Amino acid sequence: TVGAVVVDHEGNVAAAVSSGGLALKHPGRVGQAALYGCGCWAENTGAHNPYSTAVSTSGCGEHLVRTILARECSHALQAEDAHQALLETMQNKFISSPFLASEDGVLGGVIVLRSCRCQTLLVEFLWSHTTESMCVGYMSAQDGKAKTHISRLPPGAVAGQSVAIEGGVCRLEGSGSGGFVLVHAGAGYHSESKAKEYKHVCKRACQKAIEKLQAGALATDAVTAALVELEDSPFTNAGMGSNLNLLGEIECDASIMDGKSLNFGAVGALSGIKNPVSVANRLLCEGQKIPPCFLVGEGAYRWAVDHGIPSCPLEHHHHH
Amino acid sequence: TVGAVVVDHEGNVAAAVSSGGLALKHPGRVGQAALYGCGCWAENTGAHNPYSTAVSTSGCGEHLVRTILARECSHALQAEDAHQALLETMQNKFISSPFDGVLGGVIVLRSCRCQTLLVEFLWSHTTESMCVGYMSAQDGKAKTHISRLPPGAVAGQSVAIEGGVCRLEGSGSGGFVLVHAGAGYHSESKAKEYKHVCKRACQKAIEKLQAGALATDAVTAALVELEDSPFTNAGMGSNLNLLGEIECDASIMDGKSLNFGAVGALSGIKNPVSVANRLLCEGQKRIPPCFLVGEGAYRWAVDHGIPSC
Ligand SMILES: */C=C/S(=O)(=O)N1CCN(Cc2ccc(OC(F)(F)F)c(F)c2)[C@@H](COCC#C)C1
Ligand SMILES: */C=C\S(=O)(=O)N1CCN(Cc2ccc(OC(F)(F)F)c(F)c2)[C@@H](COCC#C)C1
Ligand SMILES: [Cl-]
Ligand SMILES: [Cl-]
Ligand code: NA
Ligand code: NA
């Protein structure tokens, strides 16, 4: 599972997530990366909530679905202390949820950003996870150098039971064409090898999002360009290199949310398309112009092909 | 879209929903009846919420998805005034949501111990009409009712809300069920058949409860009866998609275990709720799947002996 969250120079936020799902899963199994409220969330500031907030999840399985975690994090981040709010959410609504009571260990994570104007923009960004490790990258259009970091649980922590949480704060000039992106290449077991490859795909994903923002793109188009980069790494469980299901086939889940319009696009159990996030983003894009927001399986593939999204007929399965 | 909510003689609740989705939808479009939190919700009383609560939605489109309505209703029903809470939610988190005119509805129940069991049940809709049925194991006669918007109301802008109260003896093998056959345009004809299918749905759920069945099996038995009516947009008679085929969404949640099962874009299976219930039942025993779609869901259903069509 890979993810990204973006804020543009106006405080418009977007979020997206993409995943291959569990290895050896039954065909047609859909997990959190496709599910509204669960895999990602983006919500601009409004009357009821003073921050623009964007959230994307990491890890896989049903833990992130049962707790509707991305939306839960977004709502908690309307409290003053963002760090305390996220930590409480991870401890109380994730690790100690009653929805995961008979579960021995809860494995997952989030990337978060929230912004507010003060004309300048204050951006707080955080990551948190209960896995051994998580790889993040982040970048603002002004700093012009992506930063990458491998977040680990400290000694004495217990994976699936302890929380790690880190973050930072960034002030932007909301005058030009700037913004900020935070991405993650996955949260799971530590891997000393390929650790450099996860950091470098996070660096490249941040750069693609920043370049889109610097060319005037919408936050949804910038967060999508970051996820395309993350998907395309053979080392991430999303897009190319996704875990194979029980029949040895690839089935991808992906979704995206726009904070300004609150519209959403998602695909589930999608095979034969190089970049599942591209279909979710196109579903969101066409909805802006009742249009569908969530397509699965054969229908999602045919819809993607009819909208000129690069396909793979040899990688597409249609059982009957 | 059809739905049911059940509470058993112990106060365990369950909820389920099933739908054919939008007429002429693009193949593979999945709507609220398959989506966790959106189509149905069931949650026994716990530390954060003093009532056991079950919710099932009605209508189609994406309005019920965008507001995660079933869970939202469940959380609002933790306030004292259940009627006020549901109305506020329908007006504030549904009609006036930040997410011109929104068409849908809900059935809800909430229960608490007093050894006696107090069950409050409500339905609400912004559609012209909605057909519901309800029954307790003690009264032994199902009641069906057509809820309509009052004169002068405008569908998608006004709210209708009604409900009742039921006291159960929490000692025997009783319970209570509330069902709906859909919320949409009023139909003077076939209204008798919508009431009749709700009546049969309640009786099946009550019969299961009286045989010692779980609340999830009882709510499943209600939805199987609702699906099989050619007049409901679920199971048999589902709206055909853009290519002239049936693709069903269904889900079910257990208040006691909080487990969940769901199918989306399911073709070729007579009773989609049976598959969702079977996914839930297998989960009770690596994390087993709770949400299957498309050809994979069909193959799983047939491999588990669930009748095809
Ligand atoms: C949005 C579409 S739907 O929710 O699938 N849908 C609404 C309900 N329809 C049947 C129905 C209409 C009105 C009812 O109330 C009554 F008038 F009081 F009877 C009712 F109970 C059910 C669905 C029928 O779709 C076509 C078919 C089959 C559509
Ligand atoms: C449920 C499993 S998953 O969320 O799809 N998944 C977890 C992440 N995996 C790759 C990964 C591991 C560790 C990382 O951080 C670290 F150690 F610092 F480098 C990381 F960034 C990514 C993922 C890969 O699975 C096989 C593939 C491809 C599995
Ligand atoms: Cl599986
Ligand atoms: Cl459609
Ligand atoms: Na990949
Ligand atoms: Na039917």
Whether A15 contacts A252, CB under 8 Å: no
Q: Is B148 in the pocket of ligand 1 (CB under 6 A)?
A: no
C-alpha span between B213 and A70 (Å, rounded)? 36
The answer to whether the Cβ–Cβ distance between A28 and B99 falls below 8 Å is: no
| A157 shares contact with chain B (CB less than 8 Å) | no
Whether residue A139 is contained in a domain is answered as: yes
How far, in Å, from the CA of A187 to the mean position of ligand 2? 5
3-state secondary structure of B12: coil
Q: Can you read off the two tokens belonging to residue B253?
A: 């949640």
Q: What is the largest distance, in Å, between two alpha-carbon atoms of chain B?
A: 55
Query: B194: Cβ below 6 Å to ligand 1?
Result: yes
- Separation in Å, CA of B236 to nearest CA in chain A: 21
What's B293's domain CATH number?
3.60.20.30
Residue whose C-alpha is closest to residue A27's, from A303, A318, A315: A318
Q: Which residue's CA is the closest to the ligand 1 atom numbered 26?
A: B233
Cα Rg of chain B (Å, integer): 17
Q: Annotate A209-259 with three-state secondary structure.
A: HHHHHHCCCCHHHHHHHHHHHHHHCCCCCCCCCCCCCCCCCCCEEEEEEEC
Q: List Cβ neighbours of A158 (8 Å cut-off, separation of 6 or more).
A: none
**Is A320 inside any structural domain?**
no
B308: which DSSP letter? B
Beta-carbon contacts below 8 Å between A and B: 123
Reference B122, options B189, B185, B178; nearest CA is B178
CA distance B223 to chain A (A): 23
B159: Cα separation from own chain's centroid: 19
* SS3 of residue B134 by DSSP: strand
Q: Is the CB of B13 under 6 A from ligand 1?
A: no
In DSSP notation, chain A reads -EEEEEEETTS-EEEEEEE--STTPPTTB--GGGSTTTSEEEE---SS-SSEEEEEEES-SSHHHHTTHHHHHHHHTTSS-HHHHHHHIIIIIIIT-GGGTT-S----EEEEEEEEE--EEEEEEEEEESSSEEEEEEEETTT-S-EEEEEEPPTT--TTT--EEEEEEEEEETTSS-EEEEEEEEEES--STTHHHHHHHHHHHHHHHHHHHHTT--HHHHHHHHHHHHHHSTTSSSSTT----TTS---EEEEEEETTT--EEEEEEE-SBS-HHHHHHHHHHHHH----SEEEHHHHHHHHHHTT--B-GGG-----
User: Phi and psi at residue A247, in whole multiples of 5°?
Assistant: -95, 10
d(CA B307, CA B101): 39
Assigned domain for A294 exists: yes
Structural contact between residues B94 and B69, judged by C-beta atoms closer than 8 angstroms: yes
Hey, is the C-beta of A66 within 8 angstroms of any chain B C-beta? yes
Please judge whether A27 and B62 are an interchain contact, meaning their C-beta atoms are less than 8 angstroms apart: no
| Strand pairing category for B291-293 and B260-266 | parallel
Interchain CB contact of A65 with B (< 8 Å): yes
Assigned domain for B273 exists:
yes
Query: Counting beta carbons within 10 angstroms of the beta carbon of residue A234, is it exposed (0 to 12), middle (13 to 18) or buried (19 or more)?
Result: exposed
The experimental resolution of this structure, in angstroms, equals: 2.2
Q: Is B139 on the interface with A (CB under 8 A)?
A: no
Q: Torsions phi, psi of B57, nearest 5?
A: -100, 165
What is the signed CA dihedral for A156, A160, A163, A167, rounded to 10 degrees? 120
CA distance B201 to B131: 12
- Amino acid making up residue B115: Q
User: Does the annotation mark A1 as catalytic?
Assistant: yes
Quote the CA–CA distance of A23 and B286 in Å, as a whole number: 11
Burial class (CB in 10 A: 0-12, 13-18, 19+), A289: exposed
Where is B281: in which H helix or E strand? Answer: helix B272-283
Q: How many separate domains does chain A show? A: 1
β-bridge mates for residue A115, sequence order: A52, A123
Q: Which helix (H) or strand (E) holds B244?
A: none
What gap in Å lies between CA B104 and CA B19, rounded to an integer? Answer: 13
Amino acid at A308: G
Contact B11, B255 (CB under 8 A): no
Q: Are strands A264-270 and A294-296 parallel, antiparallel or unpaired?
A: parallel
The sheet with strand A2-8 has its strands ordered as: A147-152, A133-140, A179-188, A2-8, A13-19, A252-258, A264-270, A294-296
Identify the three-state secondary structure at position B74: helix
Nearest Cα neighbor of B184 from B146, B150, B145 is B146
Domain region containing A88: 2-315
Kind and range of the H or E run holding B94? none
- The answer to whether residue B107 is domain-embedded is yes
Contacting residues for B293 by C-beta, under 8 A, at least 6 apart: A28, A30, A268, A269, A296, A297, B30, B34, B263, B264, B265, B266
- CA–CA dist A148, A136 (Å, integer): 6
Question: Ligand 1 pocket, B182 CB below 6 A?
Answer: yes
Nearest Cα residue to B218 out of B114, B135, B112, B282:
B135
| Ligand 2 probe mutation, A69, A152, A191, most atoms within 8 A of CB | A191
Breaks in chain B after residues, C-to-N cutoff 2.5 Å: 99, 114, 285
The reply to whether ligand 1 has any atom less than 6 angstroms from the CB of B261 is: no
Domain presence at residue A42:
yes
Chain mean position to CA B27: 24
Contact predicate A309/A279, CB 8 Å: yes
Q: Compare all CA atoms of chain A with the CA of B66 and give the residue at the minimum distance.
A: A36
The answer as to whether B309 is a domain residue is: no
Q: Is residue A183 part of a domain?
A: yes
Q: Count the neighbouring beta carbons within 10 Å of the beta carbon of residue B228.
A: 17
Let me know: does B161 contact B202? Beta carbons within 8 Å. no
SS3 B161: strand
Which method was used?
A: X-ray
Judged by phi (left if over 0) then psi (alpha if -120 to 50, else beta), residue A301 lies in alpha
Out of B69, B145, B194, mutate this one to test ligand 1's pocket (max ligand atoms within 8 Å of CB): namely B194
- Which contiguous run of DSSP H or E holds residue B228? helix B215-228
